[PDB]
Amino acid sequence: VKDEVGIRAQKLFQDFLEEFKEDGEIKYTRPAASLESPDRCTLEVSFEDVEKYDQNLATAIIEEYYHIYPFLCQSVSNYVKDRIGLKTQKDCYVAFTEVPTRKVRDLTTSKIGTLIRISGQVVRTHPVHPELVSGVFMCLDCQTEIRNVEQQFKFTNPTICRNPVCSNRKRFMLDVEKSLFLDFQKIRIQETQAELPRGCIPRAVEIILRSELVETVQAGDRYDFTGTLIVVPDYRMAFLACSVQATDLPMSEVTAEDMKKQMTDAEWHKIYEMSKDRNLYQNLISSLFPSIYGNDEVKRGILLQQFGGVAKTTTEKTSLRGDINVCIVGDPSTAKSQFLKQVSDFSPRAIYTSGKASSAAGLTAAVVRDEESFDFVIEAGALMLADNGICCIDEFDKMDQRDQVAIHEAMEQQTISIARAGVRATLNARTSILAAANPINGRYDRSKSLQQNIQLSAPIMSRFDLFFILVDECNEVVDYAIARKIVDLHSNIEESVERAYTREEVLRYVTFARQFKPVISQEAGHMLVENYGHLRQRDTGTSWRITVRQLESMIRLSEAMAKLECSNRVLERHVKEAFRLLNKSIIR
Amino acid sequence: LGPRTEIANRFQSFLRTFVDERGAYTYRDRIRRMCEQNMSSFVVSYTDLANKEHVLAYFLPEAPFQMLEIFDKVAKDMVLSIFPTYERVTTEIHVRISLPLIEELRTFRKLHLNQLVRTLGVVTATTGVLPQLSVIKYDCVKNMEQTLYRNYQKITLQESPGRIPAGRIPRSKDVILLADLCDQCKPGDELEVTGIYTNNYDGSLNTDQGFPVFATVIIANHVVVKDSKQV
DNA sequence: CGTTTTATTTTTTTTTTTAAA
């Protein structure tokens, strides 16, 4: 046999994995120790291993992968038997990693049998759909025990004979029950966005995966796949893989300290200087958009949108909620989309996409009418991929008179059912949104109601609790801050404002505040009645449509700002500043 | 199977001997209650079953269906032995279970086949209620009449829209009911079931396209309604 | 020197198109 080359590559395989691997000890026995529950069979081994000790015999391994992988699966079993109390019931799952190596364009006939690394997105997917892959039978006569491999796509129930010359089309029906089979799934995946060509599109490619790899995938992530391209025995092409590499152990601005968990927020020692010194807020007004200038209210307000809301402990009779409906308008040529685009870099699930293009069927799936898999898969979508995320969108303007059917659900119902030829279920909106309309000639001419300055639909301006517009003026000394900032915009030396709070330490500290859950028996919380009352003394003049849906903002903005102190036990002062800009909201 | 000897004894020593909860155990009376309502769904609770003898969890799963045979024979032999009066009318039997452990959708997999199960669902569209065939007969020349029947309806379940794993797709599974446990399915309800996992008798076993067309199918021994919106 | 061949219909969502005082 030729492939004994790879069996000796499999000897090679054993030789280092049973022997000293790393750390003065084993790398690959705690996997082995853990597999015993269902005979789990899933084990990850580094490909650098085939460099540490195999001495770059990867090219004795990395070609014959689907050829000899079976044998590598045999090696897995031969490992386990050497020390585990074992019978040969042990199966296969090998999930290589550690390949300093990374695409769709670098594909041919020639690429069979390798272990290249690729990443994609989550769309257009199919469910668990198992395969009773092994099984027993014989010909018309007698030999009723076959522990063989009936799993190759060329498999058939009737066989010829075992001990005697029998029929050649007859069959028994046999032991599909005291034996070992598999399970798998299937999807479509598109080219990454770290890789993006001109002209061409992230074309689609399709793949399966194993039990421990299964149903452990979510919306848009960056994982490391395995390059085991394989044929269709129809042909047409496919591919396959076996290994993925997509906050207790800490984020950036750390090294290991203690917390409620291992290092979930451990680095209080360095956070806390930037936690309490309330001028740190000015870092969060200044040291975050130093390349940008506008109003200073947005740049002091968005943060709590990014940060968790209320999440209280009350009823089953009705839900209480944390996040808020949101907007931003003005007219263009005012730098009113830099920021949204930046969030896609700043924050997670900052899905900057256009709203101009989307349909009312943008959100979920619509239809299938042939046995794609089961003739009814209309549970694909666009929104609920917000995994603790938000979906802010551009061009909310010329949009249709159906989107509201979802936005009506925004902060009360948050549920997802369809009046199609399928079924109805529901889901949980995790998400807030942004507003992106615009005016006709732009200026919101201050002689007619701001509602009438665009005059859009009925309930929209009930639900959206803050709008936070920047409107144009002509006082050019305003404008001469800008270009004299862009004096360092191209002039490559420190071409912005000096910072005082890195992106990564910002992003880490976001979490520390979201696990404190304040407690409000605030007497000032009882004197919000006076706050709201003097508010309505100001509302009494200038006579908008105001209610307790805006009180919800009166509550959340200050309470969640006490969260923003990384604090329980709300503090009254947050209300007054919250009062201040919100006293503009009627005057807005 | 000489093993079959002891099991029915452990039933027969159990349905008409046991007492729990300070006398007049249900098994003395449920059968007759069933018999007075002509119901054929005499129930067992696994908790009481393990209170007596938990051995019936560990010789069960090599084939729970033969366990159910070994249940129904005992029941039958109790009814017509004690109610030979009954020996006229329907004169057939099966029983129910309510292992009262909630387990969940989207977990049954490679190792949950044809074994001791306990699951829920939520109901949506399916078909009417119709019959089938039952018996081995057709020949005499050297039959499509007088060949006993058993009703049928198709299910469709759905899963909780409350306890969802956050944008994981709502899922779907094809499952069965049968004649006596029928005419209680309607759209938009949930129902807790004993449950049991298999596939079709033969779901497209052959050299085929780049993936087999296999399905996976369940029926209920017991159904206990979770919704019950009247008294 | 014998014993067997072969059929599918209605609804979706998009992009097209089309209607009344």
Ligand SMILES: Nc1ncnc2c1ncn2[C@@H]1O[C@H](COP(=O)(O)OP(=O)(O)OP(=O)(O)O)[C@@H](O)[C@H]1O
């Ligand atoms: N305060 C500011 N900070 C940074 N840039 C500014 C500021 N004011 C004006 N600008 C510049 O003015 C330009 C305005 O045109 P711009 O490209 O923003 O249109 P736009 O706002 O994207 O239009 P729309 O938002 O309707 O899509 C921006 O590119 C921006 O760089």
